[PDB]
Design a protein around this ligand. Structure first.
Ligand code: GNP
Ligand code: MG
Lengths: 38, 426, 176, 209, 121
RNA sequence: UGCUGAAAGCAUCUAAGCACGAAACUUGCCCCGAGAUGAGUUCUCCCUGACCCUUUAAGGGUCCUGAAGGAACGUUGAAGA
RNA sequence: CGAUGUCGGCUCAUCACAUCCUGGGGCUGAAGUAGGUCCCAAGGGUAUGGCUGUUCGCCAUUUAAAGUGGUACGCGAGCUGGGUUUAGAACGUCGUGAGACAGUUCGGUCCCUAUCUGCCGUGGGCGCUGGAGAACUGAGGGGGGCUGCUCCUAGUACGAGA
RNA sequence: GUGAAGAGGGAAACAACCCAGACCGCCAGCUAAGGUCCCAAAGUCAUGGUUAAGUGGGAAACGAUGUGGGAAGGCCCAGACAGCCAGGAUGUUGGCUUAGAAGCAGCCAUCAUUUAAAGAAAGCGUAAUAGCUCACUGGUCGAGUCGGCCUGCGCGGAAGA
């Protein structure tokens, strides 16, 4: 994963989510897509 | 101070092969330096038969001549082949007006005009840095004259010694950034841990056709032209081999006589691939009389960069011009540090290159003639899956005979995973 | 919103019992109240389980629909149980039951044991498998994975407890 | 559990059959008696006061003796405390002693350590010597660099300097019991006890075990 | 022991006296050495064993001027400081033969090869 | 990293509400510590005399009492400038 | 500029966290071995020698680690005086010269008994509502915090092997 | 334009900002900028709207089912949207490739059929062959549903001695 200040997405299964204040987002294509703290 | 000196200007050129003992650059290869530099060539001033001087490198009179030649023909710069110590440039400047540059700063200038990858950027500007750090040292004089000559209260350490430390800090800084880099490409090299790691590397002068052979062997896009620095940046692409299938390739930059010291020191990152490389493929030109020398040129740097212990494979490329021979195997011995008969732009010589190679890297050719009864779809499977059946011949009642030749690690991953009661492979 | 206003309907065997915000839920074997209700004025009638936001809350149908989903889960709980097939696989591994403690074997020197909080029990059709059975739909699966937690199965051969069937990542890079 | 007030009477060298030579401090454990009990009604903490040793029976004062009136009088050289509520014990004095530990393993031990009076640095702590050659004018053994120039223009309160040392309470936490001895009220402990000869030591069991 | 400090080679293999240079183990152990291995520079030599001038090597203490505690108030003291040369890699005694008796206190590991090949404790 | 779980019928580690979670956090050890001007606890022990005038939260004065306890000095200390 | 003593070392620490290890996690081109990054983390801890005035840098051998940087480039009313900048003299070199040079070498004086502050100990006065004498509780404060290496688990899970 | 050479009040402390040019007294009054829960002078003033962060009370390119506001546009009671019931087709495993390729080693063609429906194909799988899911639709269920645009006010970016 990363903390890329820009987030976007990396598959079609990717989906933005809120958790806590933090803007998480995940896929399942590969986990590595896990953007967050954008 | 990452600053660049321009290439592409009018120049009084001065050169002297005519020194008598070290010799070097008939001129023409230096002219090529000039050429790919894009220098606005003007005239070729040349001196005579001298040992090098504490003076103005060359002789007094000729020096005066080049000075005047500048002042009249209006050269933008006194290019001056063959290296000098900074004061030499200094006294030379007193007799001129313009920037002077030795062979070195030329080569750096062109080098930097060629930089495109960020890696190349750092190692370049590094070489630029280390080089210029020396030359700056006399230049205090003006700066001193304006300074007043006494009144250094506060500092004990003298100025410019200060500046010396500055550039030291630059240096360490640069390499510092270089660190994570070599680590990077090294992380790429962790893949070189997999046991199945053929790893060739090519070598020669620039215009050793390196780009070309690499082209045809790879079916890949690597441009090639008369100019020096016809390649920059290492370049990976995989290739076939009869006995390890996969086979990583990475082109190196082409060489010259007397390539700069600190260049290499910055350049160890780029060549860090060469070191590990399991085999030094070495193309050589076939048109130049320069032949021997170039080998002697190449050997030079090979020495300083280790791994000249590596087995090598010469390719007398550029057989086209010569019609040297039909392309052939050329066992120097059973050992094969072989000469190979090529003209890369035609590249007609390849199959012998690969075949000879096929001899040169292995360690298990006990082949087996495998067989099964209707239970072989899985065999054909594995064989296409990994490397090769040598031969597929089906036969009665689904009993089917085959021949296969693999390196042993295969033999045991196979003997393990499969029941291998088929037991022709061990 | 959707289900949030969908009535729950109380099954005849089951006995719902409103008491303040919470609702005791005696049943076929379950009998509790996971629910607690900050806002929504959920209420019994014939079987009628009222919802819809009460005052002002914004959490309105959120919390409410949540409440339905809960009790509706809950009553189904007081009917019966839930999470199962909490499998483990790979060589040398095994598991067992006793009392409420559960054996597990994962290459560790110390034997793997944890004891269930009640409302759920288990069984061993094989050491390979632990079947679970709990009155209330949350805690059972939660703790089930919490049982998995000791060893999230390893990608390169799937060793490690695997919660339910659950196809997982399966890469084969940097091997031999 | 509880400790007792005994005292130092000379370090020695006891032997086994291996005779490895366990260094062995010896604390005498005289019989105690309970000066008073406290409870969670009068006082904040369920507790037992005690004493041991003896005065000259004129050395005592009545306000002291009046406390000694109650729960009888062993006389003593002072009082000592034991907070407790897991445990339980008599208003009347103990006669108990070494037996309490006859089982136990690690006594705690705590003492005052011989006073060294005012003392130099490199002894209140461990400052290095500054050099005494090659110069070092006027300062062969000196307090180092305190402060740090401008900055908050003040000096902190860590980093001591010349000052008091010794004559001070200090535990040693864990200490093994070599051997309880009902014999002569002896009590045998390994290593050594801070506290000068002829002065008392508390000796409660292990705590940091 | 310690820094510098002359040492008598114990083994036959060594060529006379040598000097200590680093004390292996620790963040930086001070006054150390009695069985602990330590780095060495040969300074004084003749052809003899496979030892040579100018080399750096691992080694062991076997005899010691400050000597050794032994569990009964014992302090076995010696005269001079015997030492045994060792690969910096293979470790291993380099020596066919010890001279001079040494304590039981050095034993186990290869050192039983030493002391078994070394008369008198 | 989770469970359950809706707002958004599916989702969902979160909105609700539970499960985790570290040399860090607060305890847990030692030392200090009612000037903690919030000046606290328990235990012991002691003094329980008369008269006079002024303003009386007040005494002032006489007279008679001196207690436990404090010391002051001296003997000295592994206590100490 | 009616004077704020300047480089390096030497006693001495102090913080930041933009992490040197150890601590907790995400992914991996994470077989395991290990790394690489990223996140979280400031508790503690984090190389002696050679060479040079050196800081550095280089080198030899270590350790888990040899982290960054701030702090009148922390620290000369604490020292050090090797470099820094005087007068002595010399060399090369520029000057017709006296003279200079950041070109190098030789030699070459460190002052202050502490009022204030804050610092470390350790005191006496008065306080706490008749008076003492010993025992207290914990309102707050500080010290305290590293870790290698060995066998057992087990030649096991890993891997063709190693 | 003030200061210098101008005192007051306010922006916590403030020459150079906003307000205002002190002839001196007065325990009188009203206002200025600026303020009004406490230090602390006066509204816990009225009503309307937003903010969920302590923004306010340090900041960007930039990221996003934050929430207020808006215009318009698409779908639909012939019932969509979400989930749910089932189908997923014959040519034809397209020709080429090749051990094998065929919806998924490729390659280029990729149609014709049937039907509400189904692509020679969106993803998985196989050595390959054959499973597995949507695209497609019937049914189901019963009101809304899917977006882009504009826009106030907020989050993420955002570390110091
Ligand atoms: N006749 C002939 N010309 C050739 C041969 N090989 C290359 N050339 C030509 O000579 C030039 C070589 O270019 P290049 O391959 O870049 O040389 P290089 O050695 O690769 N230089 P660099 O490594 O810097 O790229 C091109 O014009 C190439 O076509 C050859 O075998 N014969
Ligand atoms: Mg090339």
């Amino acid at each position: 994963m990363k903390v890329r200040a820009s987030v976007k997405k990396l598959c079609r299964n990717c989906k933005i989510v809120k958790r806590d204040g933090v803007i998480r987002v995940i896929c399942s294509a590969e986990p590595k897509h896990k953007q967050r703290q954008g | 101070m990452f600053d660049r000196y321009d290439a592409g200007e009018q120049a009084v050129l001065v050169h002297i092969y005519f020194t008598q003992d070290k010799d070097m650059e008939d001129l023409q290869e230096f002219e090529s330096l000039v050429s790919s530099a894009g220098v606005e060539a003007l005239q070729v001033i040349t001196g005579s038969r001298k040992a090098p001087h504490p003076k103005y490198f060359v002789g007094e009179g000729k020096a005066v001549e080049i000075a005047e030649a500048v002042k009249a023909t209006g050269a933008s710069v006194v290019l001056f082949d063959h290296a000098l110590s900074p004061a030499q440039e200094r006294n030379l400047e007193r007799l001129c007006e313009c920037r002077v540059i030795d062979r070195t700063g030329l080569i750096l200038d062109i080098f930097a005009q060629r930089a495109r990858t960020h890696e190349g950027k750092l190692q370049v500007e590094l070489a630029q840095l280390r080089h210029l750090a020396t030359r700056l040292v006399r230049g205090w004089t003006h700066l001193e004259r304006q300074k007043g000559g006494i009144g250094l209260r506060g500092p004990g350490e003298t100025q410019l010694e200060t500046d010396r430390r500055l550039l030291r800090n630059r240096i360490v800084q640069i390499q510092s950034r270089l660190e994570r880099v070599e680590k990077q490409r090294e992380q790429g090299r962790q893949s070189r841990i997999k046991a199945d790691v053929p790893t060739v590397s090519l070598v020669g002068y620039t215009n050793a056709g390196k780009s070309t052979l690499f082209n045809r062997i790879t079916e890949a896009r690597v441009y090639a032209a008369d100019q020096l620095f016809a390649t920059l940046d290492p370049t990976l692409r995989r290739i076939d081999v009869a006995d390890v299938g996969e086979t990583v390739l990475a082109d190196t930059v082409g060489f010259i006589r007397h390539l700069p010291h600190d260049l290499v020191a910055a350049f160890k990152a780029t060549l860090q691939e060469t070191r590990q490389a399991t085999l030094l493929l070495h193309v050589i030109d076939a048109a130049d009389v320069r032949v021997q020398e170039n080998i002697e040129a190449v050997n030079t740097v090979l020495e300083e960069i280790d791994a000249h212990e590596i087995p090598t494979l010469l390719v007398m490329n550029k057989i086209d011009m010569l019609e040297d021979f039909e392309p052939r195997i050329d066992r120097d011995e059973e050992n094969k540090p072989n000469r190979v008969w090529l003209s890369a732009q035609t590249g007609a010589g390849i199959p012998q290159l690969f075949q000879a190679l096929t001899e040169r890297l292995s360690g298990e050719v006990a082949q087996h003639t495998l067989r099964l009864p209707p239970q072989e779809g899985r065999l054909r499977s594995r064989f296409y899956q990994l490397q090769a059946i040598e031969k597929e011949w089906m036969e009665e009642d689904g009993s089917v005979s085959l021949q296969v030749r693999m390196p042993i690690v295969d033999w045991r991953r196979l003997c393990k995973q499969e029941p291998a009661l088929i037991d022709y492979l061990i | 919103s959707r289900v949030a206003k969908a009535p729950v309907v109380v099954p005849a065997g089951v006995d719902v019992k409103i008491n303040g915000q919470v609702i005791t839920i005696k049943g076929k074997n379950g009998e509790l109240t996971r629910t607690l209700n900050d806002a929504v004025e959920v209420k019994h009638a014939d079987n009628t389980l009222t919802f819809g936001p009460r005052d002002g809350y914004a959490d309105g149908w959120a919390q409410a629909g949540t409440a339905r989903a809960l009790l509706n889960s809950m009553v189904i709980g007081v009917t019966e149980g839930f999470t199962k097939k909490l499998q483990l696989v790979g060589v040398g591994y095994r598991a067992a039951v006793k009392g409420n403690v559960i054996n597990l074997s994962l290459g560790f020197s110390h034997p793997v044991d944890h004891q269930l909080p009640a409302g759920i029990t288990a069984e061993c059709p094989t050491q390979t498998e632990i079947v679970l059975k709990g009155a209330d739909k949350q805690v059972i699966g939660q703790v089930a994975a919490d049982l998995r937690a000791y060893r999230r199965p390893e990608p390169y051969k799937g060793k490690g407890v695997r919660y339910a069937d659950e196809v997982v990542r399966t890469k084969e890079a940097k091997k031999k | 559990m509880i400790g007792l007030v005994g005292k130092k009477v000379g370090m020695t060298r006891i032997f086994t059959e291996d005779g490895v030579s366990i260094p062995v401090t010896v604390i005498e454990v005289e019989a105690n008696r309970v000066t008073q009990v406290k409870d969670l009604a009068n006082d904040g903490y369920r507790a037992i006061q005690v004493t041991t040793g003896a005065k000259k029976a004129n050395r005592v004062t009545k306000p002291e003796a009046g406390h000694f009136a109650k729960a009888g009088v062993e006389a003593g050289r002072g009082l000592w405390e034991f907070r407790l509520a897991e445990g339980e014990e008599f208003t009347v004095g103990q006669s108990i002693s070494v037996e309490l530990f006859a089982d136990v393993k690690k006594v705690d031990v705590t003492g005052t350590s011989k006073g060294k009076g005012f003392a130099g640095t490199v002894k209140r702590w461990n400052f290095r010597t500054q050099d005494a050659t090659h110069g070092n004018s006027l300062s062969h053994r000196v307090p180092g660099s305190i402060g740090q120039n401008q900055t908050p223009g003040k000096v902190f309160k860590g980093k001591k300097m010349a000052g008091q040392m010794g004559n001070e309470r200090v535990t040693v936490q864990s200490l093994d019991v070599v051997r309880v001895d009902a014999e002569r009220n002896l009590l045998l402990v390994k290593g050594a006890v801070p506290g000068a000869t002829g002065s008392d030591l508390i000796v409660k069991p292990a705590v940091k075990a | 022991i310690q820094e510098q400090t002359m040492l008598n080679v114990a083994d036959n293999s060594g060529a006379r006296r040598v000097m200590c240079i680093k004390v292996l183990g620790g963040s930086h152990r001070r006054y150390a050495g009695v069985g602990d291995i330590i780095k060495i520079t040969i300074k004084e030599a003749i052809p003899r064993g496979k030892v040579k001038k100018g080399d750096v090597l691992k080694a062991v203490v076997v005899r010691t001027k400050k000597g050794v505690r032994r569990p009964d108030g014992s302090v076995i003291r010696f005269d001079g400081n015997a030492c045994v040369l060792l690969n910096n890699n293979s470790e291993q005694p380099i020596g066919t033969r010890i001279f001079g008796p040494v304590t039981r206190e050095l034993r186990s590991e290869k050192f039983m090869k030493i002391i078994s090949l070394a008369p008198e404790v």
